């Protein structure tokens, strides 16, 4: 969502974009610079070729039954067995609706063993 | 010899019309056949003899016909080829329309908020929901929350509505295969109790085959939560007229000296206004202190159309006993009957027509409307005429604050 | 360590139609809970709100807070013939135990989903094709009924089979129709030379018929084709050939399509009589 | 080895014996028995509810009925076991999604902690006859308790000390995450998985050696459970 | 609870612009009411006045 | 339990492998490379020659 020279971003449906924010007052200041996304948005993911390439929502495993957070089959948002260096996949920003406003991650794992992580 | 082509269109708007009442085809049809002419100055065919008609394996009669008895598919109307007397072949045939026969409701189910224990009021909840239709596709999805399960007396509402309430919505351009709605909800309930809410999806494909899934969560108040928000007085009033507020909290309002009638003319003076007094509209939810108060405030004011009586109850009669397809013999009668006697037997919805949010400099909530269904009238479904029957009967407002506390009024359209 | 010896929740498959020219499809077939498909059917599963188990709360003092099974991995497809469920031996409970059974039996398989697929997909789809139109692999055999079972595994390998099974049975065959012939029954005053081809007065014609191939859905009930001759509808037996001219003359024929649609298949080529009065 | 989820009546506290049954080769069979004691945990309260369920053939459609916590006999939609391949005969026990709930939970700071429900669980009652025939030989008629060489005495204590139990429930399956026609549902043809050559090999007398009772339980994350059930009409 | 922030931060207010549409171009019912959003989108297709969008209150 | 060409594991009724987790949402992210295990799988340990070799499962 780039900015138009009128002062606001673009009209698109879908986006996204990297925002600064501050909050104090009473409290002493504390800032996040992070990534705001509507809509359904594309992401890329870099790889070696030939590595298998697996791109949930939120956990990888590991349900948490108290707070009634749970993974499930469904929040896999691409896996390839094979890959020729490069991954692309696309994320609805409405899932997990409880977390609009705070971070929510992207887990990326390859060949099993590797574990990263994007807010 | 000449042969005129022959027509057939989806006439079947119950439960909701379709899209294109010429290729996508649901329930009864009505089908126009053309007829066999010799040429003008000939010796003018054998006498009592006429065409044939065939769609797909059935022998077809200009009139009402039934699709159930059909396959899903692709199809076009057939005719035999007959020639004059004299033994002339017909001269030029017509390529009649290729339809498509779709009598099945969508695939609908929920993948969150499954296998449910409780939630708290004020928390937001995500629900997420899939639908799918092999026939002519997904088109319309809404989502709705239900305090009360297996009623179908509408003109009734309980202290917690008792109806489907919507709270999100989508819409498919191209007809695909398959779409997911993902939407949250804040949770809401009534003071210092627990109870069980329905999440409700109900999705229509493009010859108007509707589905409705349900999923069960335990919303329990919160610990703040123990009364309902206060509530001013509010009237709705046209928009040249003025307010005569009543105070009618957590209850729904007959016409009273200022009606509301739909608005079918771009007269901008017989609009329809919702209106909520600001003075009398508080919170009394809270967390002395350390010298600052924690508090609950307002989160919303919300304005929504109720859906007419009359149109629901055919809809939901059409879903419960009358849908052909119940009485077709390639189905599982007792299969579609008890998946939607599960899910049908609701009361008719409230639709979210917007918010009215911070109050005007005159210190009101108020909200503008046509009182026309958003269903109908070209915004999702083409339906003009009647508009007794396609017209909201109840103009409601819900105010809830940041507890999940939430009060309830509004007053019944005059149509 | 961390131990997995669990598989994750039952996956249900689940039977949707496809949109095109060469498919068609009947839910239940008979009152037997049989779904016929011509062409294409698309099988996914119903609830990816499966999670991998065993989950839950860590006990006291772990590692973790929670337990980490090894997560979900997959979901595969699998059609057997039901002829070959005659033998009671074969394992249904302890899912385990019914999914190396299934595997075992096996005759149709598909690939195994990775993932639930685009927005605008099925969760976790395939496609089942058949009939010679079709281009999609794996393809089916007609005249048989399937069961198709779901077998979801986890990342270890621990596989469960699917709590229930679909029925569907593929037929891309369209009917076919036998000839009809028309001969002279009428002597009077001095008989036809040769009633194949002169023909005169009242004469005698016999019908052919249209039927599906055996062991296929059918034809629509109660349906029956229409013969012609030249210009007028001719019913089986006695016809008087003096309500239509002199000429060469053909009986023809209207073409039906089964109960799924099938075009038909073979038709016949009828005899040329000439009609002298 | 194996893992057990326990389970308990809410806020109750009590004694339950686990038991291993072992074959060897001949059809010799043994039962040993160990002790111990289930608590109910601070969050379980309430038994989760149930909504309707019924036991149906596969070619039919369902009756349900609301019957928690019980088993009902046979109602206008009986099931039988099924010998054949006939995939129309098979039997399917299902349970309503929508009614299903477990109120078990741990307000709270703006995120209720709960307990969610854990498994749906299918069995099949083995035979009350074909039992009582197995336990009466096990207690009165094995000629081995007549044996002169053997201690009758101890092989009858050890025995009347594990095997005065009731008929046991088999383990069929998980019906598990509910599927789009809001229905927890599970497939059999109501043979037993101990004969039939899946375990041994008994083929006449269909009655002997089917289940008698098609019957589920619903357990949750607090360890609170609940069972329904339908007899089989055989 | 267990956030990266103890409150929401959503994306925060922007902008406000004013739009003038004929009372006629109302005539077609099939404009959408509903869904404030949507409402938005029926208003931008008809307008035919259109104020340049406002960023600050002002003095 | 090595990788098919497929993307699954093979087929086997006991064996290993290590596999990284990672958890989050609403929590930072935290995570795991274990071995995983299942059935009955074996392991080899080395000692110097004449070294008395004990093994015990969880604790001495």
């Given at each position: ?26 409290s002493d200041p504390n800032g996040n610079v ?86 | ?208 085959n509707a589905t409705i899934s349900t999923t ?200 | ?235 089986a037996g006695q016809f008087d050939t003096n ?35």
């Amino acid at each position: 969502l780039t900015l138009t020279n009128e002062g606001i971003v673009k009209d698109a449906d879908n986006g996204w974009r990297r925002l600064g924010q501050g909050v104090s007052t009473p409290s002493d200041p504390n800032g996040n610079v992070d990534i705001y996304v509507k809509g359904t948005v594309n992401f890329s993911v870099n790889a070696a070729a030939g590595s298998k390439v697996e791109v949930f929502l939120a956990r990888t495993t590991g349900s948490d039954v108290p707070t009634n957070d749970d993974v499930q089959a469904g929040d896999v948002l691409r896996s390839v067995a094979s890959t020729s260096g490069t991954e692309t996949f696309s994320l609805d920003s409405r899932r997990l609706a409880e977390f609009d406003g705070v971070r929510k991650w992207i887990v990326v794992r390859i060949n099993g063993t590797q574990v990263t992580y994007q807010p | 010899p000449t042969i005129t082509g022959s027509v057939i269109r989806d006439t079947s708007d119950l439960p909701f019309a379709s899209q294109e009442p010429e290729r996508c085809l649901s329930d009864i049809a009505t089908i126009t056949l053309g007829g066999i002419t010799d040429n003008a100055g000939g010796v003018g065919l054998n006498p009592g003899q006429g065409l044939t008609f065939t769609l797909g394996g059935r022998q077809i009669q200009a009139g009402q016909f039934d699709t159930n008895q059909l396959a899903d598919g692709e199809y076009t109307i057939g005719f035999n080829s007959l020639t004059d007397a004299l033994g002339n072949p017909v001269v030029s045939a017509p390529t009649n329309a290729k339809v498509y026969i779709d009598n099945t409701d969508p695939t609908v189910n929920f993948n969150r908020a499954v296998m449910q224990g409780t939630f708290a009021s004020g928390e937001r909840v995500s629900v997420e929901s899939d639908a799918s239709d092999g026939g002519c596709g997904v088109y319309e999805t809404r989502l709705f929350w239900d305090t009360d399960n297996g009623v179908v007396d509408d003109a009734t509402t309980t202290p917690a509505i008792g109806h489907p309430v919507q709270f999100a919505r989508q819409r498919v351009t191209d007809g695909a295969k398959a779409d997911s709605l993902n939407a949250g909800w804040n949770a809401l309930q009534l003071p210092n109790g627990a109870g069980a809410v329905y999440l409700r999806a109900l999705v229509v494909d493009r010859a108007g085959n509707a589905t409705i899934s349900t999923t069960p969560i335990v919303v329990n108040a919160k610990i703040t939560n123990q009364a309902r928000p206060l509530l001013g007085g509010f009237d709705a009033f046209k928009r040249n007229a003025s307010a005569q507020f009543m105070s009618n909290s957590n209850a729904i309002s007959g016409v009273n000296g200022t009606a509301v009638t739909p608005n079918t003319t771009a007269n901008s003076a017989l609009d329809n206004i919702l209106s909520l007094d600001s003075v009398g509209t508080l919170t009394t939810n809270a967390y002395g202190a350390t010298e600052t108060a924690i508090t609950e405030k307002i989160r919303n004011v919300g304005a929504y159309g109720r859906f007419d009586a009359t149109q629901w109850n055919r809809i939901r009669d059409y879903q419960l006993n009358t849908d052909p397809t119940l009485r077709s013999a390639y189905v599982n009668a007792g299969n579609l009957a008890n998946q939607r006697g599960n899910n049908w037997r609701i009361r008719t919805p409230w639709v979210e027509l917007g918010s009215s949010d911070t109050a005007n400099t005159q210190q009101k909530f108020d909200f503008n409307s046509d009182l026309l269904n958003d269903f109908y009238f070209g915004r999702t479904f083409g339906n003009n005429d009647n508009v007794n029957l396609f017209s909201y009967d109840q103009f409601n407002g819900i105010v809830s604050g940041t507890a999940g506390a939430y009060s309830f009024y509004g007053e019944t359209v005059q149509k | 360590v961390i131990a997995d010896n669990k598989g994750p929740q039952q996956p249900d498959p689940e039977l949707n139609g496809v949109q095109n020219a060469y498919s068609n499809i009947l839910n239940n077939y008979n009152n037997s809970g049989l779904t016929y498909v011509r062409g294409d059917v698309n099988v996914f599963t119903g609830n990816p709100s499966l999670q991998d188990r065993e989950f839950g709360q860590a006990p006291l003092g772990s590692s973790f807070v929670q337990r980490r099974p090894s997560g979900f991995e997959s979901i595969r497809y699998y059609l057997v013939p039901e002829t070959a469920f005659g033998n009671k031996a074969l394992q249904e409970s302890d899912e385990m135990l019914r999914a190396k059974a299934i595997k075992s039996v096996a005759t149709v398989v598909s690939a195994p989903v990775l993932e639930p697929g685009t927005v605008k997909a099925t969760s976790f789809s395939r496609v089942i094709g058949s009939g010679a139109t079709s281009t999609v692999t794996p393809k089916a055999q007609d005249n048989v009924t399937y069961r198709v079972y779901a077998i979801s595994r986890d990342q270890l390998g621990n596989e469960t089979a699917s709590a229930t099974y679909e029925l569907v049975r593929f037929d891309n065959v369209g009917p076919t129709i036998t000839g009809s012939v028309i001969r002279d029954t009428s002597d009077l005053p001095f008989a036809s030379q040769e009633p194949e081809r002169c023909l005169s007065d009242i004469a005698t014609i016999t019908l052919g018929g249209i039927t599906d191939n055996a062991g296929g859905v059918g034809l629509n009930p109660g349906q029956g084709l229409t013969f012609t001759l030249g210009g007028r509808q001719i019913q089986a037996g006695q016809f008087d050939t003096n309500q239509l001219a002199d000429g060469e003359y053909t009986i023809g024929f209207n073409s039906l399509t089964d109960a799924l649609g099938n075009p038909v298949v073979s038709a016949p080529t009828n005899a040329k009589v000439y009609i002298d009065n």
